[PDB]
Design goal:
Two copies of one chain form a homodimer. Chain A has 324 residues and is mainly alpha-helical. Chain A has twelve helices and four strands. The complex binds heme C (4 copies) and calcium ion (2 copies). Chains A, B: Keywords: Calcium, Electron transport, Heme, Iron, Metal-binding, Oxidoreductase, Periplasm, Peroxidase, Signal, Transport.
Chain lengths: 324, 324
């Protein structure tokens, strides 16, 4: 009431309807093409890794590993964040280095430790699969050559735009139903507010809104915060950016373990205590941390129900997989 | 007419309704659990490989690689055959070493170059995921401890039993519609019959019915037939079994390239010519091989439309992934 209203002041429920991307209108055809591409492992050089591998729609849009493993079984430096609701973040990646989903999508396609593919190889492959060119024409009509690395990224973005998780019990709560979360969950909300967590995890996505040092008050240590990953410093070369990362969206945080960009903290409860100490210079008690987790559990929304695409088959001209 | 009737004499259309497994009744709950397990990468030690990785429902129930790659990016000796209709084969694997789908399923789970998992680790993991035990109870009621390696295999088998591809244009043809395949496809059928191919690829599954040398008339060479893979000889130790493999089902063969147990022949047309020479001591002409491919294309059925499961999340007690 006091606390319901305070909450309504800082957060917003996820909308039912996908957001509108600029310079990228959705249409059943464009959305459908992006779904196909999201699950097509032929976007990787090896023909074995899809977006779904590291952002599994079945497992909260993530891979439940410390750090993602891709081409050659190589591990990356970072935990894979969820694609769910990612559309409502202000920029993409832990260091915000991509401005939106379309710019983001080009990254994993070319990264040597993810899909390890090159644009020319991907385009050659897509044009050699006879069912794809017609789908790119329905998706991108009035273009003489619709099969381009840019249109892949565009198709994927409007598909991701549909990957939202409305109707979490907390969104029902924000919409005026007090009974939608438990007493305990409400007390966890009150702790979350009073302790200062919403400074950095607020708005429609409970996070995703800005960049902050990981360690405002204490260094979280060389395991939780690998000294080599200076976050936004590698993007801007600005000293003030060292160890600065985007605050994540806490939506669906209960099912996207492990936690932090390093993926080294498996227990959400430990994540809560580390936030208290590292960001706010406090020791949150065990009881208190438990109440905040209970609150954080009500941020899990309805998971998208995604039909696995039936992908168009190779032709004989399809490029060969590349595994080395 | 002459040829439609000859065909009706040797082949049967895939039934609409999944077959009944013995000692394994289907039920919405058991089927549903097996679907979840099929797409759950936590059946592998690394938490990254599911059945769907190497038998992708989007790509004809296969992985479109020469030979499958699994744990540690290790390649196996064999091409991954389709799970689609596999239920109608007389035994499972290229060498028939598993008698049915339930016995088959235990193989990839433990194989070091596939999922590389052990039964005790898999069971511990499944029991530690709070949403799984209730699902095993709905699937296997009246069992004090339903979460067992055997029940995983059972659930998966009744799910695979639903993964059938009815209504291929050839099945419409066999059902009395002459117009259901093209003139050319009918001439390819007539070549397939006259040349002797149905000796080994007949019945409801166009194959899957028995064991034959790969090289009845000529050695196909050390690339198409790696000299180290003696097929059924490694299962029976019987000399007469050397280089004997099960005939595959040719259903959906146009979308499950590459071909043979070695996965070394990418073009179905080359596969046809190699069958002619290796199995029947003939040189099938280019024109003739083209007509047979056209026929083989009408063996592609309606692909299952499979919802990607929303999998139950880990708890904090869930075993850690193992990547090494
Ligand atoms: C196929 C083209 C895709 C798509 C559409 C996305 N991914 Fe990934 N992803 C991976 C890792 C480790 C990260 C974090 C990297 C970092 O911050 O430096 C990402 C990040 C993303 C995002 C950003 C989401 C956010 O909230 O910041 C998005 C939208 C995204 N991915 C979508 C790991 C991998 C892989 C592992 C090997 C693979 C494959 C992909 N991603 C592929 C794709
Ligand atoms: C108040 C006590 C809280 C609570 C309960 C949480 N936070 Fe934060 N948070 C911030 C940043 C930049 C990050 C990313 C840091 C990194 O990994 O490099 C986080 C991360 C989290 C998580 C993990 C979520 C995940 O997907 O991994 C959680 C559960 C979390 N936070 C909860 C930024 C800030 C702040 C800005 C200065 C403040 C204040 C807080 N967080 C406080 C809290
Ligand atoms: C997850 C538990 C599964 C399930 C249900 C199946 N698979 Fe595989 N599979 C792979 C390879 C290379 C083969 C051929 C191996 C050989 O013959 O020696 C298989 C075989 C099968 C079959 C047999 C089908 C037939 O017609 O003979 C079936 C039913 C089957 N699989 C189902 C490759 C892999 C993997 C690659 C790394 C993974 C993972 C799996 N399989 C996992 C599973
Ligand atoms: C008559 C000319 C044909 C045609 C068109 C095909 N076949 Fe056969 N076939 C047999 C066996 C044991 C195998 C497996 C061999 C191995 O890989 O070790 C095959 C394989 C095929 C394929 C490839 C299908 C695939 O999924 O990889 C194709 C397209 C094919 N055949 C077509 C057994 C026999 C026979 C038994 C002695 C005879 C006769 C034929 N095949 C003849 C033909
Ligand atoms: Ca995570
Ligand atoms: Ca094959």
């Amino acid at each position: 009431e006091d606390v319901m209203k305070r909450a309504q002041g800082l957060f917003k429920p996820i909308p039912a309807k996908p957001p509108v991307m600029k310079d990228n209108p959705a249409s059943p055809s464009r959305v459908e093409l992006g779904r196909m591409l999201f699950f097509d492992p032929r976007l990787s050089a090896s023909h074995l890794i899809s977006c779904n591998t590291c952002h599994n729609v079945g497992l909260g849009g993530t891979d439940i590993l410390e750090t993602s493993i891709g081409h050659g079984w190589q591990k990356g430096p970072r935990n894979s964040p969820t694609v769910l609701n990612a559309v409502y973040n202000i920029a993409q990646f832990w260091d915000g280095r991509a401005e939106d989903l379309a710019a983001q999508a080009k990254g994993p396609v070319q990264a040597s430790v993810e899909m390890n593919n090159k644009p020319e190889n991907l385009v050659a492959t897509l044009k050699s699969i006879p069912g794809y060119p017609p789908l790119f024409r329905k998706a991108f009509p009035g273009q003489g050559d619709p099969v381009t690395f840019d249109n892949v990224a565009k198709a994927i973005e409007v598909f991701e735009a549909t990957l939202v998780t409305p109707d979490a019990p907390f969104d029902k709560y924000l919409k005026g139903n007090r009974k939608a979360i438990s007493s305990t969950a409400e007390q966890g909300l009150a702790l979350f507010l009073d302790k200062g967590c919403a400074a950095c995890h607020s708005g429609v996505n409970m996070g995703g809104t800005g960049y902050f040092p990981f360690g405002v008050r204490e260094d979280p240590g060389p395991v939780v915060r690998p000294v080599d990953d200076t976050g936004r410093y590698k993007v801007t070369s600005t000293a003030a950016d060292k160890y600065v990362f985007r605050s994540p969206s806490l939506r669906n945080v209960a099912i996207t373990m492990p936690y932090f960009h390093s993926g080294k903290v498996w227990k959400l409860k430990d994540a809560v205590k580390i936030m208290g100490s590292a960001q706010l210079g406090i020791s949150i008690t065990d009881a208190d941390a438990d109440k905040i987790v209970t609150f954080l559990n009500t941020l899990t929304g309805a998971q998208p129900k995604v039909m696995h695409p039936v992908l168009p088959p190779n032709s004989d001209d399809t490029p060969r997989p590349v595994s080395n």
